[PDB]
Amino acid sequence: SLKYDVVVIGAGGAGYHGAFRLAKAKYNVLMADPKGELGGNCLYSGCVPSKTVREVIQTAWRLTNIANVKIPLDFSTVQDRKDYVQELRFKQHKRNMSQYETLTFYKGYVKIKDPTHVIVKTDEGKEIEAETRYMIIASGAETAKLRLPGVEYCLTSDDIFGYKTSFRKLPQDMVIIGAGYIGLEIASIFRLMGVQTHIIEMLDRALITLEDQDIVNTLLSILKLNIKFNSPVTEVKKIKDDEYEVIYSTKDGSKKSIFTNSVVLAAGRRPVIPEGAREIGLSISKTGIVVDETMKTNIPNVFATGDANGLAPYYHAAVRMSIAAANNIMANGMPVDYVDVKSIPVTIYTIPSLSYVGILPSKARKMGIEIVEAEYNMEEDVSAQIYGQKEGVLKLIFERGSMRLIGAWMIGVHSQYLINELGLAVAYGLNAKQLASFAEQHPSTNEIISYTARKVIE
Amino acid sequence: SLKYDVVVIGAGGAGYHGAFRLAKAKYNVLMADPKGELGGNCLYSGCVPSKTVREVIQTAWRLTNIAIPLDFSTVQDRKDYVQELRFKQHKRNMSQYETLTFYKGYVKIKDPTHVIVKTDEGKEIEAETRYMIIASGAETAKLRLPGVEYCLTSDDIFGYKTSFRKLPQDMVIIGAGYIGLEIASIFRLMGVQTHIIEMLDRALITLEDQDIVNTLLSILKLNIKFNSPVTEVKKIKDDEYEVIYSTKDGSKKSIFTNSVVLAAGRRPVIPEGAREIGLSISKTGIVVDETMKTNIPNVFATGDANGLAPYYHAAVRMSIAAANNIMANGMPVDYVDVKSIPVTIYTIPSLSYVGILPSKARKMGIEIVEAEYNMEEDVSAQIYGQKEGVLKLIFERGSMRLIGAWMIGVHSQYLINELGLAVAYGLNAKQLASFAEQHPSTNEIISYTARKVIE
Amino acid sequence: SLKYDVVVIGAGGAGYHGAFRLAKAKYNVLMADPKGELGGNCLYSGCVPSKTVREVIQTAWRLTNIAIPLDFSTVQDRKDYVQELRFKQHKRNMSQYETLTFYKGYVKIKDPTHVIVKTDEGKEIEAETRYMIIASGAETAKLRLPGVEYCLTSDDIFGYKTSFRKLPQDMVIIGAGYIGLEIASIFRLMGVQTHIIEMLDRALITLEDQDIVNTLLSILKLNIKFNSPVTEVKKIKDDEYEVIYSTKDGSKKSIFTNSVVLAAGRRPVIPEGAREIGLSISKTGIVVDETMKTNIPNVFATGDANGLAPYYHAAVRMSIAAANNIMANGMPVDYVDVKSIPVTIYTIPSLSYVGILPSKARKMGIEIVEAEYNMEEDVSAQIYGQKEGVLKLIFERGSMRLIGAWMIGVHSQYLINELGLAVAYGLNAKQLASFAEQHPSTNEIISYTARKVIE
Amino acid sequence: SLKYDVVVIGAGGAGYHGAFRLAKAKYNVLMADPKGELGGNCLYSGCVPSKTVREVIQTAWRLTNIANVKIPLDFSTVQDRKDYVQELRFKQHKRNMSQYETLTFYKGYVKIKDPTHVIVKTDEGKEIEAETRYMIIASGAETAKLRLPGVEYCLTSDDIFGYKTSFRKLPQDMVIIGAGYIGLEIASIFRLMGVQTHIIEMLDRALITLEDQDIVNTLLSILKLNIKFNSPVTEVKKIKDDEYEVIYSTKDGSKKSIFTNSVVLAAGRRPVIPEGAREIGLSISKTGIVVDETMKTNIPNVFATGDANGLAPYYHAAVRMSIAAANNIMANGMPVDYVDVKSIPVTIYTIPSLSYVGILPSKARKMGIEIVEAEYNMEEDVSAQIYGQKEGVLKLIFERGSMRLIGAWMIGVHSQYLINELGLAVAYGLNAKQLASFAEQHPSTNEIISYTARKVIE
Ligand SMILES: Nc1ncnc2c1ncn2[C@@H]1O[C@H](COP(=O)(O)OP(=O)(O)O)[C@@H](O)[C@H]1O
Ligand SMILES: Nc1ncnc2c1ncn2[C@@H]1O[C@H](COP(=O)(O)OP(=O)(O)O)[C@@H](O)[C@H]1O
Ligand SMILES: Nc1ncnc2c1ncn2[C@@H]1O[C@H](COP(=O)(O)OP(=O)(O)O)[C@@H](O)[C@H]1O
Ligand SMILES: Nc1ncnc2c1ncn2[C@@H]1O[C@H](COP(=O)(O)OP(=O)(O)O)[C@@H](O)[C@H]1O
């Protein structure tokens, strides 16, 4: 009834970067999100605040290893800094949005009527009915709605890192349900702030999202967390404030119990499908809305970007997917842009962190690619030594013959920065020689990459 | 005589990385350095200790900004522990190579194939060799003025086990070169009141782009005086000095301070006997080509002694190139591309740069487009309250090849390596735009900034 | 710059005795030597350690002759204990002088009034001075032949804390100069079979009198080959070598031995930068006059670096003379008389000599009378069974002034000082005849021999 | 009845050097000595054998300080070497004598009839009656014939050092009667060979022959001998072989006793006056035959040389005196030669030895000569250090004004060699400057002299 070029459902990374590119091309674009803010869940309660918290505490700890006396920091001060940062960024995305005159934004939820028609339902409000030529579904994911008694007594990430959260005081000890990336991250950071942590995992292994058990095992050997495997939780009991009981079965079948001050549910997140999506015939699987590499669904004027598709549930990937949807829409659905998920780096933000990119040795084995590995030991890097954080390794994965760098992984200080240099090499197929001949800035940690590449040849 | 395949004079990065590679291939190599340690001056008094001090005090300051006192002596203890550890590490690595012989001593060159090594004990070992690598580095320039004796140098400040273990309240720094700016920046953050006096008309002459230097100065806001040659330093009491200087016009002025630092540039170090054998040597250093070969065809020269790129990581790369060419018995199988080696000035915030910058592009006749990002918007800048700065990408029109980049801001030292790789192997704006940096690392601003040019 | 009155380069006897005297008068003096000890090469590897070995093994042998086994390692322990003690003694003495600053380092000369001292740490201290004393000594000559690397030098043999701690059974010595003859003599007495090969036609060229050298050789009875340049030293096994040499005629010959010593003379050591400032320098060393003043008028040169009299005690005397002249602000108040400095070649028995000898007297046109004594008749020679030798007094006809003397025999090193004093201050035959030496010291032969000329 | 130019009474140093010089001038000379050998008492039983013994034992001890294990030497082997040396020298003086055809030698004693006539009494023989123009009395001295009960049980120097002596076995301990030079020497050497020594001295002080108590005290502080002063011996008792009792009074008057294996009489020697000497009117005092500096007596054709005159009872002085007598006789009694006793060096052959020459500080004080002393400490000399014999000092005595070296003394290693260099300076009056400017052979001990002279100026 009002008319637009594109509707974007969801205003996280998956949505707004695309929307901004379209708007800049003078496309009329309607974006709607219930939060009424940009950044989605990742800004509201994921990466941004979690890293903020991670940095403040890492800075405290490095200083404690250097001045070798203990440093006094209240968790409420850490949570203030997390909020100050979230607040700057909400304002900044609004101020950047306000520059695009042909972009209209609504605080509300989009329901789909048919491939060219939607209805935006606002908070205390009416139906806005809209017509459109293309649609970008960028509705993200949510915390997995588990059916287990006591679920209501568990904290989630939203509670721990949410903007203006009231979780502002540390417990003496905490049980984390789940050994995936969110759980391990939470276990790492809270342990560093003085909390006793226990992880209980249903399955036999941590980090299912990473297919390579040898890499997972190396990280666990460095982390030395208290992890119980093969231990489904069957109930959470609340005794009183700050007193819970988590009940669980074991690999034998015998029930067992652990008492704690605080229970955190770190299950996987699940894709969020907008109302009406099934009804217009959109192919949807377990992992999410099915898309090809151009982000196009089985309905040809409908794209799906970010966690809604499940292809690579990390914020930087969602942004990349968003821009590719925008490009393809501008080219009127001709496939002019594509996303290469292999070459997207991933970081698990434990302390130390694990980063990786490309093809790792186990997938290489299954594809029949013959490889050669090069190895560096992080005890020998300058910054590691300064800060007293000497654990970890870098591993470069080269294909035999071409010696193309086809993959890389790294546990240690600054892996999040190094992984990008290496991801670039991987994405455009540089070889050991090119890596050896490059001369990274001394004394930065990136200097271990050309160094490690010089090794393989020698 | 004792016969060797290669003799490496100097055991800094310009020396030992190549020695190691030649030894790994079982060449018989002889290396000497008077310190009797690996790492050169860079380790003893340059990059490792200065960046260690820099990282420690910036960590103190970051935490200060987000929520504690550290004495300077503790910082300097940390600097010393790291130096010590790395000396031990290079010796451990050296012990792996059976065919590498190391002496504590100076090398004199006798002819293109003969050297003698002089030890302290006064022993002199004669040796014959097929190739030499001159990796003998550089040394502090020695200005002659009354009162120079009262000046501290960066060697006094960062030297291993230095006695400089207490902070003056006010400090005057002679030189606006990169060592001057770095010292001023770090010490200002530890609470020292700093002042720079520079005889020439500008800062950072090693950087041809004045627009970039002006941007850095405007963000750093240092008290600097230009066209002000010092004529005398007078001592009045302990921890009390008068720096006397001349204005542009010719009139005398003076400043009173607690401490004076000389930072006047470095000069290439030429081994005894190098001149006598006819090595072609300019002002800037031993003349070499890109293969690191000198006018004498079995003699190579690497690192600060050649003056092409006086940074440790450039030095390591040249050492490796010398070793590859020697192994190919002189054939030029390896070459160093200087413009694609990143440089970082370690002020706070730092300046990093690589490749071809606008001043140079203009002189070459290359037409360019610049894409830019303001560091106020970076997540890590926000977390730390370090919001000053800017990233600029330099693209070649037509190809949109990335030919240069410069950045002032936090983590410029990490970002510049990603960018340096793109410059080195010729990636274009589309390629950088299509790559997805790890969120929320500061690296995300690169592809973010490449996406904006395309818009 | 730091301002000094004098800079002394080298801390051997040629350096420190003068430094000490200048410091005693409160001059500000700066001294440097890379060993970071006083005593020079003489202490580290020359006279003190060699004479210590000589005295120990001659004491063993005397007792053997009058009535027990000593391992060579014990001798070398004794040599090391004495060296150690004297290093400590010179440091104790140096600590008495508040105005003397000592560095472990090399001095480079920049101009007649400026030096820089380079330390191992790599620190370089610039310094300005009114006077210099170049006291930088001498070094082993470096013959270039295949297998030189297998040769021991007297440095290896007598050096402080040397690893040479076990005696070979047979030894070949290259050089019939005084170090060659001394080494051969001592080691023969420890049971080593010695052989000398000398390229030139005679021994001890530093001594112009062939009659004297022939007398010494005829008493020493060493196996020596003349006109026999070595062309190669080959190693066959541990403790097994082939010395290959050419005859006068041109034909090749070889000798098989367990050990080879090179003793090829010493060469003067010239500080870096001395040439560059225009110091007049010959083959034999830095040219000086008798005041020790060089062609640069505020620069003096003492000891083996000048080459006039390359013996420690001559060096000490020149150091003192430099210091007196400096104190007189350059006026020539003190002079060294070389011919009146005694010399002793420390073979067993030794040869000592002083003043003008017959070869020289003949060339000058001085007519002489020689008085002589046979050492068979000396009491101490008889007690020890060391009866080989002769004392000769050289008298000037008319005056009967004692102008020279030479002696082979026991205690020649003590007797020569009495005689040197008579030569130096011009005593005549009557005066020596009238003096009554302590009986039964070996000195009684002097006045005994002066009484016979008068008869 | 036979006719000669000169008669020489005694064939020691005082006699034969003069005799040889005369004979060489073709003077007919008759020399007679009861020993029938040349060298006198000094060769028979003084310096030559005592130094021989001293050297062998010093060589043993130096080697013991260097190899730092003990060295085995029987005293009989030391006595063999003493005899071998004495034997060479008896033969050598005879072989040198045989070269002078106008010198006639007799084994016998000379009696003087009048200034021009003597009688030689041979061993199993007649009177040879002789006429002569000059006479040289060179009859030396003997061991002082003391009146004390038990004197016959004491050894003397003649017994200890005599040629072919039967004293060839060391006692465990020995009492030495006398703290003069012979006694201290004997105490030094025997102590070094393992013997326990005690010296008992009549007088209040050691070394009366040296007027300077400060010098004597320094030597005693280094020697650390067992000396009893003010203790005249009153009797020597023999219990059995190797068992004696020496009885003595003390400074109070109370008798006391010491038991020993061996008693040595080290009294002063006394001049020996030939028969007839008094009767012709020769002036004779306590110290000996009175002579002027030309060795001439009150009877003008009679000279007296060596210990017979008592002016300087050391062998090298006696030789010097002999030659001066020979010269003056040749010049027919005109005083053409003179002896300067001040400038004759003296050594006391303890271990370490003391040597001295010239004017010492106490005589200087009495003459009113103002002096300055220079001092060197023997711990710092090379040879001292090699041999481990580091005790002692060198002292140079300069007159103020001229800075003439007027005296010197030295306790330590090689003082006997150094004293000659210094005696030469003293005899011809060199000054500090001349000593400083001279450069003694390095590394000999004489190098401490120019060194010490350089000090005084500084
Ligand atoms: N029907 C809908 N209409 C509008 N917004 C939606 C709808 N369903 C979910 N969203 C929003 O989409 C956003 C997705 O953000 P996020 O979970 O960070 O995913 P991504 O990383 O894929 O952007 C959330 O802010 C959520 O409120
Ligand atoms: N003649 C010489 N012989 C041996 N080493 C030398 C000589 N001259 C200088 N050097 C050494 O060479 C090293 C140079 O290293 P450095 O100054 O760090 O430069 P680079 O980074 O180019 O290696 C120093 O450690 C210095 O001591
Ligand atoms: N450039 C220099 N700077 C300082 N000392 C030096 C230099 N060259 C040589 N030397 C030192 O000078 C000393 C010379 O002493 P030595 O060889 O014993 O001769 P001399 O007997 O003449 O003193 C040696 O210890 C040597 O290390
Ligand atoms: N009347 C005499 N006739 C000949 N010889 C004598 C007479 N009296 C003593 N003698 C001898 O004179 C010698 C003196 O020797 P010595 O005591 O060494 O004194 P000096 O050192 O004075 O020569 C002795 O050998 C002794 O036998």
mmCIF file of N, CA, C and O in Angstrom, chain C residues 400 425-436 447 450 454, chain D residues 424 427-428:
data_model
loop_
_atom_site.group_PDB
_atom_site.id
_atom_site.type_symbol
_atom_site.label_atom_id
_atom_site.label_comp_id
_atom_site.label_asym_id
_atom_site.label_seq_id
_atom_site.Cartn_x
_atom_site.Cartn_y
_atom_site.Cartn_z
ATOM 1 N N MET C 400 139.507 3.688 29.284
ATOM 2 C CA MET C 400 139.056 2.410 29.852
ATOM 3 C C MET C 400 137.640 2.508 30.467
ATOM 4 O O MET C 400 137.318 1.882 31.480
ATOM 5 N N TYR C 425 126.390 5.179 33.389
ATOM 6 C CA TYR C 425 126.967 6.367 34.017
ATOM 7 C C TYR C 425 128.484 6.386 33.912
ATOM 8 O O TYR C 425 129.147 7.148 34.581
ATOM 9 N N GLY C 426 129.018 5.547 33.028
ATOM 10 C CA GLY C 426 130.378 5.723 32.541
ATOM 11 C C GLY C 426 131.538 5.344 33.433
ATOM 12 O O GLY C 426 132.604 5.914 33.314
ATOM 13 N N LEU C 427 131.372 4.338 34.270
ATOM 14 C CA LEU C 427 132.444 3.886 35.154
ATOM 15 C C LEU C 427 133.581 3.220 34.379
ATOM 16 O O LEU C 427 133.364 2.631 33.344
ATOM 17 N N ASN C 428 134.808 3.332 34.866
ATOM 18 C CA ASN C 428 135.960 2.764 34.160
ATOM 19 C C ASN C 428 136.458 1.516 34.845
ATOM 20 O O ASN C 428 135.990 1.153 35.937
ATOM 21 N N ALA C 429 137.387 0.848 34.169
ATOM 22 C CA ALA C 429 138.039 -0.355 34.691
ATOM 23 C C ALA C 429 138.594 -0.215 36.107
ATOM 24 O O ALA C 429 138.472 -1.130 36.889
ATOM 25 N N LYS C 430 139.179 0.924 36.453
ATOM 26 C CA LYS C 430 139.744 1.083 37.819
ATOM 27 C C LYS C 430 138.583 1.026 38.798
ATOM 28 O O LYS C 430 138.618 0.240 39.758
ATOM 29 N N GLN C 431 137.546 1.817 38.541
ATOM 30 C CA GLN C 431 136.368 1.849 39.401
ATOM 31 C C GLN C 431 135.694 0.492 39.663
ATOM 32 O O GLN C 431 135.235 0.231 40.771
ATOM 33 N N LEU C 432 135.650 -0.367 38.650
ATOM 34 C CA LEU C 432 135.032 -1.679 38.790
ATOM 35 C C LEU C 432 135.955 -2.616 39.537
ATOM 36 O O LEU C 432 135.522 -3.419 40.371
ATOM 37 N N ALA C 433 137.228 -2.542 39.180
ATOM 38 C CA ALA C 433 138.275 -3.244 39.900
ATOM 39 C C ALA C 433 138.270 -2.884 41.404
ATOM 40 O O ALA C 433 138.385 -3.790 42.207
ATOM 41 N N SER C 434 138.092 -1.602 41.775
ATOM 42 C CA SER C 434 138.130 -1.177 43.202
ATOM 43 C C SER C 434 136.896 -1.533 43.977
ATOM 44 O O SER C 434 136.922 -1.487 45.216
ATOM 45 N N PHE C 435 135.805 -1.865 43.278
ATOM 46 C CA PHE C 435 134.580 -2.213 43.995
ATOM 47 C C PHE C 435 134.600 -3.692 44.425
ATOM 48 O O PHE C 435 135.020 -4.537 43.665
ATOM 49 N N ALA C 436 134.139 -3.996 45.636
ATOM 50 C CA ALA C 436 134.209 -5.373 46.167
ATOM 51 C C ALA C 436 132.823 -6.042 46.251
ATOM 52 O O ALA C 436 132.112 -5.895 47.237
ATOM 53 N N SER C 447 134.363 -7.638 39.294
ATOM 54 C CA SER C 447 135.521 -6.895 39.738
ATOM 55 C C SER C 447 136.720 -7.815 39.618
ATOM 56 O O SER C 447 137.812 -7.356 39.295
ATOM 57 N N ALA C 450 137.551 -7.203 35.888
ATOM 58 C CA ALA C 450 138.160 -5.876 35.789
ATOM 59 C C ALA C 450 139.600 -5.791 36.393
ATOM 60 O O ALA C 450 140.454 -5.061 35.894
ATOM 61 N N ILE C 454 143.635 -4.935 34.190
ATOM 62 C CA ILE C 454 144.649 -4.067 34.802
ATOM 63 C C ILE C 454 146.000 -4.808 34.970
ATOM 64 O O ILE C 454 147.060 -4.194 34.977
ATOM 65 N N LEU D 424 127.467 -0.344 44.232
ATOM 66 C CA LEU D 424 128.129 0.411 43.174
ATOM 67 C C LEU D 424 127.641 1.832 43.163
ATOM 68 O O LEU D 424 128.446 2.718 43.039
ATOM 69 N N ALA D 427 129.200 3.556 46.199
ATOM 70 C CA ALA D 427 130.657 3.792 46.053
ATOM 71 C C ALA D 427 131.007 4.969 45.131
ATOM 72 O O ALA D 427 131.998 5.657 45.335
ATOM 73 N N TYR D 428 130.210 5.218 44.109
ATOM 74 C CA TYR D 428 130.532 6.319 43.208
ATOM 75 C C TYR D 428 129.371 7.345 43.229
ATOM 76 O O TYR D 428 129.184 8.144 42.332
#
